[PDB]
Amino acid sequence: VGYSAPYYSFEASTQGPFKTPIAAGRGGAQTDENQAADGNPRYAFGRQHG
Amino acid sequence: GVGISTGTFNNQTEFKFLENGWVEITANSSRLVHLNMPESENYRRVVVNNMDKTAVNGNMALDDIHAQIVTPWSLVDANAWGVWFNPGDWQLIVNTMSELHLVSFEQEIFNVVLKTVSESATQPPTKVYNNDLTASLMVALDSNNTMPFTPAAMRSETLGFYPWKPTIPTPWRYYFQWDRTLIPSHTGTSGTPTNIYHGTDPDDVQFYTIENSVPVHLLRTGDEFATGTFFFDCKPCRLTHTWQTNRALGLPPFLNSLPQSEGATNFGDIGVQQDKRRGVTQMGNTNYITEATIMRPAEVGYSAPYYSFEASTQGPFKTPIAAGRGGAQTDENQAADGNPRYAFGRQHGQKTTTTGETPERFTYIAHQDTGRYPEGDWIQNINFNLPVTNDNVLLPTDPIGGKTGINYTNIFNTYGPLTALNNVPPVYPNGQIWDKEFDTDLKPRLHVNAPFVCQNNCPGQLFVKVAPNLTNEYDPDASANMSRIVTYSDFWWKGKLVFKAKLRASHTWNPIQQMSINVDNQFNYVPSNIGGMKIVYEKSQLAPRKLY
Amino acid sequence: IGGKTGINYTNIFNTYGPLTALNNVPPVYPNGQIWDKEFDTDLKPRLHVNAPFVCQNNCPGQLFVKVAPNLTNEYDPDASANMSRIVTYSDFWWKGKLVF
Amino acid sequence: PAAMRSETLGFYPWKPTIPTPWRYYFQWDRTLIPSHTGTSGTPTNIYHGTDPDDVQFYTIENSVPVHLLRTGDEFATGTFFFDCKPCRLTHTWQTNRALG
Amino acid sequence: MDKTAVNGNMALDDIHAQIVTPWSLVDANAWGVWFNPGDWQLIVNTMSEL
Amino acid sequence: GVGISTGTFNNQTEFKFLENGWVEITANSSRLVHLNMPESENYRRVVVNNMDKTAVNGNMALDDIHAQIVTPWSLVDANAWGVWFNPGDWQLIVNTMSELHLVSFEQEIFNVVLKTVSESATQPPTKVYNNDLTASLMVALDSNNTMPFTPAAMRSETLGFYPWKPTIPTPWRYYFQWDRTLIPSHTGTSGTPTNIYHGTDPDDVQFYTIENSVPVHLLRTGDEFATGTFFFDCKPCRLTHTWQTNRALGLPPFLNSLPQSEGATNFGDIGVQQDKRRGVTQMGNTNYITEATIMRPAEVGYSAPYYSFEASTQGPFKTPIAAGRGGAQTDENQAADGNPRYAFGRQHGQKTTTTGETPERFTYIAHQDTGRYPEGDWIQNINFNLPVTNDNVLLPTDPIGGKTGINYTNIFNTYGPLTALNNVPPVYPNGQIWDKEFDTDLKPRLHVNAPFVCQNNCPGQLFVKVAPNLTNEYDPDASANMSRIVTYSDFWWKGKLVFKAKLRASHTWNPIQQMSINVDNQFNYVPSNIGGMKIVYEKSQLAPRKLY
Amino acid sequence: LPPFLNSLPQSEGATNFGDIGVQQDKRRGVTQMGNTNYITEATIMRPAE
C-alpha cells in the first residue's frame, strides 16, 4: 500500500528543471503543519476564490 | 512443372486512398534467394566461452559466454523496414501520414532451382554446374509458433534491401540454457574474480527440432509454396513526435509586463514575487511558486540507472531504457544512454562498393523530447532553505560510494504511477517492424526494438533447407560423416505487407518539418558510376503533436 | 549519502514496483480542479495529481471570448503603427450546468 | 486549466467576475546546471532558443468557428458527456501493517 | 537568469516562451464554482462515490 | 436586425479526402473591412502626364502617362493566394498534391455598422463616435461582368493576408482611352524626341457608371448580403515542375566504355567517332551526330526579344515572356527577364512591425527548367565547316547595329510550331489566383499573371460604398460641393473558395523536394514579441514530373 | 487596374493632371523585370500581349 519516491527531486529535460511529482504526501501521527513533507498540495489564491 | 514458372516477381508498393483520409499501403517485396547445403546435417549443442577476455579485470561487459543449438536449417526473415520500402516511399509515409497500422503479411516461394557443382579437376581445375531436376528444397512454416522466436534484424541478418540484388537466408540457431557466474571488478582489482560457466539446469532444458515439430514440404522445380494471409493484432504506431516537457504543460503564468520593443533581450515579465503568487504546488512547506515548482498533472518521461548491468542466472546484461536524449545538449558529442545504435553490411545500407569489413553504423536520435539531461538533476533536503547549502543538495557532481566518476544519477529511478511515455519510433531501414510479446504473466509496456508487438498472434517463422543429395556410397551405421553431392538452390521469395495509414492535417499557422532531398544528401539516393549503392537511414516522427 | 549531511538515502529512494497499490487523489474544495485532459502519450499516467477526474477519449472544449475590434474613422492597415480603437468593453451573463 | 493559477470564474454568485487572458506555452531549449551556496564559478545557465521541429503556432481564427453575438444574440454549447471512472468519497487507513 | 544567477537558487527558474493571444478564456473547472460549503457538506457527509 | 448578428466568422480551411486520391479543399476566409466616405461623390476623368521625367533622353521606360476614370466606389478584391491559405496550408498542398482544380467561389457581407464622427472642437479638440442606426452601406455585384476587370493584385491592393487584422477595400478606378506618342532616345540624343499626349479617339470612348449598370443594394445594420455560388471553368494547375531540356529527351547514346572505378573524373565514353555514329539529325549536310546535333521531337521553351518595349496607340510597353531563367547560371546575381517581381506592404507580407515605407519585394525563380541562357546561344553559317570561323558565327558577343551592349539574342525569337511550354506556376502569397480571358478573336495560350484563366465565365466584381449622409443644408443647384456628415462603415466579409486536388504518388527510388521549416526559416512563421508578423513567399511546383 | 492617384486635380484645366503620389522605385505591384525596382506603366505586368 503506497510507495517511496525521491524527495525534493528536480529532474531535467529539454526545457529546464522541474519537480518530480508524487501521488500522496504524509501527515497524521507525525505530520501536521510542523511535520511538513512532500506530496501534499499547496493552494494560493485571491479574493475571488476564498 | 519443369519448363513452367510458378510465380511472379513484384516489388511495387501500392498506396490506395479510401474514405475519410485512410490509405491502405500494400508493400510487395521480391528477392532471389541463394542457399547452400548445410555444414552438417546435424543439430549441434555448442558453448561459447570467452573467459580469456573477461579474465582482464574491468572487462565484464565484454562477456559473450552462451550455449546455443546449431541447426541444419536456414531462416528466411523479412522483418526490417528496408525490405519493404525505399527512401522514396518512406518520404511519402513519414511526411504525409500521421499514424500507421500493420494489418497483414503473406509470403510465397516460387521458381525453385537446384544445381550440383561438379569439379573437373583439370590443369586449371574446372567445375561444371548442372541442374538436378528431381532434387528438392525443404520448406517449413512454423505457424503454431513452436520454435523460439529469433528476429534476424538484431544481427543485421534479414533479407537484403535492394530488389535487383540476390540475397540469402540465415543459418538458424537458438539459445540453449546455461548457468554462468561473473563477478565485476576494475582495473587493478587484486585477484581473480569468480568467472564461472556452471553448465545447464536440467529443469531449464528444451532441445527443439524442426522435423519433429513442423510439417515439412519438399518442393522440386515444378513446385511452389505459399503461406496464406496472416492478420496481426497491434496498436497503431504514431508518426508524430511530442516536444512538451513537464515544464511546458498547461497555463503559462500571466505576464504583467510585455516587451515594448522587438529584441532578443526584450523579455516580458511575470509581474509578481515568486513568494507572492497564486497557483498550486506540491511543496507544502513553501510559498515559492516558480516554473520548476508549480504543479503539473503527471510526469512525461522517467529517470533510470545508466550503464547499469544486472545479473541473473546467465551472466550480466545491460538494463534497457525506453528513450534516450539529444537536442539542445545531445548530439554525437552529447552522447548518452537510451539511443539505439545500428551496425550493418552491404546488403542493408553499407555502401555497396566500399571495400573493408568495418560495419556501417549509426546512433538514432529520435525527435520526441521524453528523455533526460542527468546533469541538470538535483536532490535537495526538504527544509528548502534556498541558496541551498552544499550539504542540503546532492548534485550530479558529488560522488557516490566515493567513486569520483559515479553520481546519484547513475543509480537513480524516477519511474512511478504518474509516468507518461510513448512507444519507440520506427527506424528506417535497419529497424525491426514487429515483435512477439513475452509469454510472461505480467508484460512489458513496450519493446525497445519494434513499434509493433503482436500479442495474441504472430506470423510463424519460415525455415528452408536443401534436402540431402546422397552419393552411391552411404552407410548409416558408420561413425563417419555422410557424404553428399554438392548441391545448392536458388528460389524466388515474394512477400506482401499491408498497412493502413491515416493522412495528416495541418493545425498550425507555421509549416512542419518534412523529409526532403537536398544538395547535401542527394547523392545518397542514386547509384555510383560503379553501380555502388547505399541506403542512409532516416527519421520517422518528423511532425509535432500536442501532448496536452 | 554523498557525504552530504543533509541528504540520506530516503531522498533518492524508490520503492514503486509490481505490488504497489495506491488510490487516486481526493477532491480539494473549493480551489481544486474538477477534470483534466489525459496526455496524448502512448503509455499514460495511472493518475493526475491535480484532478480526480481525467477524461480520456473526450473532454469538453475550451471557451474563448473577445470584444471584436471597434474601429474609429481613421484606420490604415498599411501603417506600421498601432490600430486605434474606440474603448469598448462588454458584460455578459454565463450560465453553466454540471451533472453528477 | 485556469485552476492551476487560481484564475477560474469566481466562487460567489452575487459577485461579478472576469475571464483570463488566454496564453499557451511555445517551445524553447534551456540549460541550467545546479549548484550551491559557494559553488566556485558560474554554472551554465543558458536559454538556447527553439527546436524548429518542436514549433507549433496556433491561432483561434484559423482553427475554430467564431461567433459574433450582438445584444439580441445568445450562445449555448450543447451538452457534453464525460468518460470518467468514479471518484470515491472515502479514505482508506490500513497500512501494510494492518492487513489480514 | 539574474535570479538563478545566484548559486543554490535553480529551483527559482521561470524561463519559458509563450504565445500571448488577444483572446480570453472562460474557465469554470474548480469545485468552488459549482458548490457552496452547504452543498459540499451534503455530498461529503452522505455520499460514498461521485 | 439592430441587436442581431447576421453572420458568422470563418477562416478555417477544410481538406476532405474523397475516393481515388482526390481531395476537396474548401478555404474559408473572413475579414473585418473598414470603409470611409468618398473623397467626392463624383466620377472624375483624370490624366497623368509625367512628361517631365521622360523629358530626359534615355528614360522612355519611365513613362506613366494615362487617363483613367476615378469612381466614388471601392472594390472588394480577394484574389491572391495569401487571402485563403497560410504557410501551414500551403505546405500541405504543395508537398502532397500533384494538381489543383479551382471549382467555385462565394462571398457575403454581414454585421454591417455605420458610425459618424462628431468633433467637439474643445481645448484638446475632441471627437465622439456615434452609431448612425438608419444609415446604409451600398453593395453592387457586377455579376454580368459589365465593368472592366481590374485585378487588385497587380497593385498589391487585395484584402490583407491575416485573419486577426482588419482590412480595407480599394478605391475603384479604370483606364479611359488616350492617344500618346513617345520616341525613344538615349543619353546624349541631340534634341528633344517627340513626346506627345494627343488625347482621346472618340470612337474608343467608354464611360461606365456603377449606378446605371448594376443593381445596387442598400444594407443597414440589420441587413446582410450574399453573392451565390459561382462555378469557374478552368484547366487544372500542375503542382510539379519539369526539368528536361531538348538535351535530355529520349534515348541517350549507348556508352561503349563504362567507368571501372568510382571517381568524379571517371566518365564513361560513347565509343564512336562523332562522324561515324548512327541516328538522326536535321543537318542534311553533315555526318556529325552529337548531343547538340541529334534530332529531338520538338523544342521545350523558346527565345524571345529581351528588354523589348513595343508601342501602340498609347505609349510603350514591355513585351511579356512566358518563362524566365535561373539555376546553374541564374540566381539574384544571374539576373534575367521572364521572372516576376513582387512589391508589397504590411497587409501582404512586409514585416508588420517594420518602420519605413520601402515596399517589401522578391523576384520569383520558378523550378521548371523551360527558359534560356542567351549567353550560350550561337547562329552559324550553313556550310558547317567546324572550328567555326569568326565570320560564320554570330555570338551573343558580337554587336548588332554597332551597339556594343546589344547582340542578336536581344532581338531573337525562336517560337514556332514545335514550341512546348507550361503555364505559369502559383506565387504564394502575393500572386493572383484567377484571371479573365481577353474578349479577343484569337486568345493567348496563357496569362503570365494567374495559373487560372476563366474563359466563358468569371465571378463578377464586388463594389461597396457608404451612401450619402446629407446634412440639413443641401442645394442641388449649387456649383459647390455637397456637404456630408462624416460617416464610415465597418462590415465583415466572408468568402469561400473550393478547390479539388489529387494526391501525389512516388515513382522514383529517391526522395522528392519538400517544403519544410528549419533553423534558418523558422522565425518567419511566428509572431515577434511586439506581435510583428511577416509572410515570406514560397515556391509551388517543388516535385519533378517527366516531360517525355 | 490603373495606379491609385494620391493627388487629384483641384481645378478644371488641360494641364491639371492628377498624380500617382509614389516614387517609381518605391511602388508596390508586379513586373517581369526581376532586376529592377521601377514600376511604371511601361514596366508593370500585363496578362498577355
CSV table of N, CA and C in Angstrom, one decimal, chain D residues 1-3 7-11 19-28 30 32 34-37 39 41 43 45 47 57 60-61 66 86-90, chain E residues 1-2 4-11 13 15-33 35 40 43-44 47-50:
chain,number,residue,atom,x,y,z
D,1,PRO,N,-5.9,24.5,-18.1
D,1,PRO,CA,-6.7,24.6,-16.9
D,1,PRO,C,-6.4,25.8,-16.1
D,2,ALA,N,-7.3,26.8,-16.0
D,2,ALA,CA,-7.0,28.1,-15.3
D,2,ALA,C,-6.9,27.8,-13.8
D,3,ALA,N,-7.3,26.7,-13.3
D,3,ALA,CA,-7.2,26.5,-11.9
D,3,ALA,C,-5.8,26.3,-11.3
D,7,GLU,N,-7.2,31.1,-11.5
D,7,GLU,CA,-7.8,32.0,-12.5
D,7,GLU,C,-9.0,31.5,-13.1
D,8,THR,N,-9.9,30.9,-12.3
D,8,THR,CA,-11.2,30.4,-12.7
D,8,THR,C,-12.3,31.5,-12.5
D,9,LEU,N,-13.5,31.1,-12.8
D,9,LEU,CA,-14.6,32.1,-12.6
D,9,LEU,C,-14.5,32.2,-11.1
D,10,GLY,N,-15.1,33.2,-10.5
D,10,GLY,CA,-15.1,33.4,-9.1
D,10,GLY,C,-16.1,32.5,-8.4
D,11,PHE,N,-16.0,32.3,-7.1
D,11,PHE,CA,-16.8,31.4,-6.3
D,11,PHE,C,-18.1,32.0,-5.7
D,19,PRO,N,-13.0,36.6,-17.1
D,19,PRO,CA,-12.3,35.6,-17.7
D,19,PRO,C,-10.8,35.8,-17.7
D,20,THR,N,-9.9,34.8,-18.1
D,20,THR,CA,-8.5,35.1,-18.1
D,20,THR,C,-8.0,35.3,-19.6
D,21,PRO,N,-6.9,36.1,-19.6
D,21,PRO,CA,-6.3,36.3,-20.9
D,21,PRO,C,-5.7,35.0,-21.3
D,22,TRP,N,-6.0,34.5,-22.5
D,22,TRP,CA,-5.5,33.2,-22.9
D,22,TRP,C,-4.1,33.3,-23.4
D,23,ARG,N,-3.2,32.4,-22.9
D,23,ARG,CA,-1.8,32.3,-23.4
D,23,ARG,C,-1.5,30.8,-23.4
D,24,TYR,N,-0.5,30.4,-24.1
D,24,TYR,CA,-0.1,29.0,-24.1
D,24,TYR,C,1.4,28.9,-24.3
D,25,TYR,N,2.1,27.8,-23.9
D,25,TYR,CA,3.5,27.6,-23.9
D,25,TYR,C,3.9,27.3,-25.4
D,26,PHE,N,5.0,27.9,-25.7
D,26,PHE,CA,5.7,27.9,-27.0
D,26,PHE,C,7.1,27.2,-26.8
D,27,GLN,N,7.5,26.2,-27.5
D,27,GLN,CA,8.8,25.5,-27.3
D,27,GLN,C,10.0,26.4,-27.2
D,28,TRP,N,10.9,26.0,-26.3
D,28,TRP,CA,12.2,26.7,-26.1
D,28,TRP,C,13.2,25.6,-25.6
D,30,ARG,N,16.4,25.2,-22.8
D,30,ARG,CA,17.2,25.9,-21.9
D,30,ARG,C,18.1,25.0,-21.0
D,32,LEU,N,20.5,24.6,-17.4
D,32,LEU,CA,20.8,25.2,-16.1
D,32,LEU,C,21.5,24.2,-15.2
D,34,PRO,N,22.8,22.8,-11.8
D,34,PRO,CA,22.7,23.1,-10.4
D,34,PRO,C,24.0,23.4,-9.7
D,35,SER,N,23.8,24.1,-8.6
D,35,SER,CA,25.0,24.5,-7.8
D,35,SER,C,24.5,24.7,-6.4
D,36,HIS,N,25.4,25.2,-5.6
D,36,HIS,CA,25.0,25.5,-4.2
D,36,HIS,C,25.8,26.7,-3.7
D,37,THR,N,25.3,27.2,-2.6
D,37,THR,CA,25.9,28.4,-1.9
D,37,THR,C,27.4,28.2,-2.0
D,39,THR,N,29.8,27.5,-4.6
D,39,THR,CA,30.0,26.7,-5.8
D,39,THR,C,30.9,27.7,-6.5
D,41,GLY,N,32.6,29.6,-9.2
D,41,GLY,CA,32.3,29.8,-10.7
D,41,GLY,C,30.9,30.2,-11.0
D,43,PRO,N,27.9,28.4,-13.0
D,43,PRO,CA,27.3,27.2,-13.7
D,43,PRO,C,26.6,27.6,-15.0
D,45,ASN,N,24.1,28.4,-17.4
D,45,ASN,CA,22.6,28.8,-17.3
D,45,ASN,C,22.3,29.4,-18.7
D,47,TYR,N,19.8,29.8,-22.2
D,47,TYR,CA,18.5,29.8,-22.9
D,47,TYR,C,18.9,29.6,-24.4
D,57,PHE,N,2.7,27.2,-33.8
D,57,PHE,CA,2.0,28.5,-33.5
D,57,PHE,C,0.5,28.3,-33.9
D,60,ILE,N,-6.7,31.1,-33.0
D,60,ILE,CA,-8.1,30.8,-32.8
D,60,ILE,C,-8.8,30.9,-34.1
D,61,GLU,N,-8.7,32.1,-34.7
D,61,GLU,CA,-9.3,32.4,-36.0
D,61,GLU,C,-9.2,31.4,-37.1
D,66,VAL,N,-15.9,31.1,-35.4
D,66,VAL,CA,-16.1,32.3,-34.4
D,66,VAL,C,-17.5,32.8,-34.6
D,86,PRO,N,-15.3,6.6,-11.5
D,86,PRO,CA,-15.9,7.3,-10.4
D,86,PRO,C,-14.8,7.7,-9.4
D,87,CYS,N,-15.2,8.6,-8.6
D,87,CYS,CA,-14.4,9.2,-7.5
D,87,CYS,C,-14.9,8.7,-6.2
D,88,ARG,N,-14.1,8.2,-5.4
D,88,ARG,CA,-14.5,7.7,-4.1
D,88,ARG,C,-14.5,8.8,-3.1
D,89,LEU,N,-15.5,8.8,-2.2
D,89,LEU,CA,-15.6,9.8,-1.2
D,89,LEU,C,-15.2,9.3,0.2
D,90,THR,N,-14.4,8.3,0.2
D,90,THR,CA,-14.0,7.7,1.4
D,90,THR,C,-12.5,7.5,1.4
E,1,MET,N,17.1,34.8,-15.5
E,1,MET,CA,18.5,34.4,-15.4
E,1,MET,C,19.2,35.0,-14.2
E,2,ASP,N,18.9,36.3,-13.9
E,2,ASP,CA,19.5,37.0,-12.8
E,2,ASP,C,19.3,36.4,-11.5
E,4,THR,N,18.6,33.2,-11.0
E,4,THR,CA,19.2,31.8,-11.0
E,4,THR,C,20.7,32.0,-11.0
E,5,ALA,N,21.0,33.2,-11.4
E,5,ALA,CA,22.4,33.6,-11.4
E,5,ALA,C,23.0,33.4,-10.0
E,6,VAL,N,22.3,33.4,-9.0
E,6,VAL,CA,22.8,33.1,-7.6
E,6,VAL,C,23.0,31.7,-7.4
E,7,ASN,N,24.2,31.1,-7.2
E,7,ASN,CA,24.3,29.6,-7.0
E,7,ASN,C,23.4,29.1,-5.9
E,8,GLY,N,22.8,28.0,-6.0
E,8,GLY,CA,21.9,27.4,-5.0
E,8,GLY,C,20.4,27.9,-5.1
E,9,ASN,N,20.1,28.6,-6.2
E,9,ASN,CA,18.7,29.1,-6.5
E,9,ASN,C,18.0,28.5,-7.7
E,10,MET,N,18.5,27.4,-8.3
E,10,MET,CA,18.0,26.8,-9.5
E,10,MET,C,16.5,26.5,-9.5
E,11,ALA,N,16.0,26.1,-8.3
E,11,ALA,CA,14.6,25.9,-8.2
E,11,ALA,C,13.8,27.1,-8.4
E,13,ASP,N,13.9,29.1,-11.1
E,13,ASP,CA,13.9,29.1,-12.5
E,13,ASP,C,12.5,29.5,-13.1
E,15,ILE,N,12.3,30.8,-16.6
E,15,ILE,CA,12.5,31.0,-18.1
E,15,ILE,C,11.5,30.1,-18.9
E,16,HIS,N,10.8,30.7,-19.8
E,16,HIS,CA,9.9,30.0,-20.7
E,16,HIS,C,9.5,30.9,-21.8
E,17,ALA,N,8.9,30.3,-22.8
E,17,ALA,CA,8.4,31.1,-24.0
E,17,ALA,C,6.9,30.7,-24.0
E,18,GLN,N,6.1,31.6,-24.5
E,18,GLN,CA,4.7,31.5,-24.6
E,18,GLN,C,4.2,32.4,-25.7
E,19,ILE,N,3.0,32.1,-26.1
E,19,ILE,CA,2.3,32.9,-27.1
E,19,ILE,C,1.2,33.6,-26.4
E,20,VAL,N,1.2,34.9,-26.5
E,20,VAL,CA,0.2,35.8,-25.9
E,20,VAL,C,-0.9,36.0,-26.9
E,21,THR,N,-2.2,35.7,-26.6
E,21,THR,CA,-3.3,35.9,-27.6
E,21,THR,C,-4.3,36.9,-27.2
E,22,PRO,N,-4.9,37.5,-28.2
E,22,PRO,CA,-5.9,38.6,-28.0
E,22,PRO,C,-7.2,38.0,-27.4
E,23,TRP,N,-7.2,36.7,-27.1
E,23,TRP,CA,-8.4,36.1,-26.5
E,23,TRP,C,-8.5,35.8,-25.1
E,24,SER,N,-9.7,35.8,-24.5
E,24,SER,CA,-9.8,35.4,-23.1
E,24,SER,C,-10.4,34.0,-22.9
E,25,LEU,N,-10.0,33.4,-21.9
E,25,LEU,CA,-10.5,32.0,-21.6
E,25,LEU,C,-11.6,32.0,-20.5
E,26,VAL,N,-12.8,31.4,-20.7
E,26,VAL,CA,-13.8,31.3,-19.7
E,26,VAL,C,-13.6,29.9,-19.1
E,27,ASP,N,-13.0,29.9,-17.9
E,27,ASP,CA,-12.8,28.5,-17.2
E,27,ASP,C,-13.7,28.3,-16.0
E,28,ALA,N,-14.4,27.2,-15.9
E,28,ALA,CA,-15.2,27.1,-14.7
E,28,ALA,C,-14.9,25.8,-14.0
E,29,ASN,N,-13.7,25.3,-14.3
E,29,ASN,CA,-13.4,24.0,-13.6
E,29,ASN,C,-12.7,24.1,-12.3
E,30,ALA,N,-13.4,24.3,-11.3
E,30,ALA,CA,-12.9,24.4,-9.9
E,30,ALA,C,-14.2,24.1,-9.1
E,31,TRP,N,-14.1,23.3,-8.0
E,31,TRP,CA,-15.2,23.0,-7.1
E,31,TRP,C,-16.0,24.2,-6.7
E,32,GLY,N,-15.4,25.2,-6.2
E,32,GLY,CA,-16.0,26.4,-5.7
E,32,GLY,C,-16.9,27.1,-6.7
E,33,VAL,N,-16.9,26.8,-8.0
E,33,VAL,CA,-17.7,27.5,-9.0
E,33,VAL,C,-19.2,26.9,-8.9
E,35,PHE,N,-20.3,24.4,-6.2
E,35,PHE,CA,-20.9,24.1,-4.8
E,35,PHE,C,-20.5,25.1,-3.7
E,40,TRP,N,-21.4,21.1,-0.2
E,40,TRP,CA,-20.3,20.2,0.0
E,40,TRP,C,-20.5,19.4,1.2
E,43,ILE,N,-22.7,16.3,0.2
E,43,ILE,CA,-22.1,15.4,-0.7
E,43,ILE,C,-21.2,14.4,0.1
E,44,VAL,N,-20.2,15.2,0.7
E,44,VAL,CA,-19.1,14.7,1.5
E,44,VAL,C,-19.7,13.9,2.7
E,47,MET,N,-22.6,10.9,0.7
E,47,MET,CA,-22.4,10.0,-0.5
E,47,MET,C,-21.1,9.2,-0.3
E,48,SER,N,-21.0,8.2,-1.1
E,48,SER,CA,-19.8,7.4,-1.0
E,48,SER,C,-19.0,7.3,-2.2
E,49,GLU,N,-19.5,7.8,-3.3
E,49,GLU,CA,-18.7,7.8,-4.6
E,49,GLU,C,-19.4,8.9,-5.5
E,50,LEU,N,-18.6,9.6,-6.3
E,50,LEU,CA,-19.1,10.6,-7.2
E,50,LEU,C,-18.9,10.3,-8.7
